[PDB]
Amino acid sequence: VQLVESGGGLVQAGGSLRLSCVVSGSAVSDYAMGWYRQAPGKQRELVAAIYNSGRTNYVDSVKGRFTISKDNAKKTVYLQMNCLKPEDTADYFCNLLGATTMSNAVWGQGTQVTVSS
Ligand SMILES: [Hg+2]
User: Fold this and answer.
1) How far apart are CA 66 and CA 100, in angstroms?
2) How far is the CA of 82 from the centre of ligand 1 (A)?
3) Where are the alpha helices (DSSP H) in the chain?
4) Which residues are found with C-beta within 5 Å of the ion, ligand 1?
5) Structural domains of the chain, with CATH
6) Minimal CA–CA distance to 58: which of 83, 76, 40, 75?
7) From CA 7, how far away is CA 79, in angstroms rounded?
């Protein structure tokens, strides 16, 4: 898969961002997708998942604050990020679910989110 993230930036605590992930091919239509984040001294962790049916789930720390969605026609996955806190500072990536362990996974450059206090 080919993946290009955008929308990150510097934001103030309490603010909002909308991240986009444009995917080549039909991955958005064919596979469950997720948004991941990698904090300074950590590994990539799944924070939001969207399943083929349109069902979603979230890690507890972002539930109610972040919303994952997709547009099949635009081959894009979105992460609406509200109620941002400094602890959300991280590099954000989108990918097929399982990409942290599955063979031949490919990652984009990610998009950096920095939340100031
Ligand atoms: Hg909130």
Assistant:
1) 21
2) 6
3) 27-30
4) 65, 83
5) 1-117 (2.60.40.10)
6) 83
7) 9
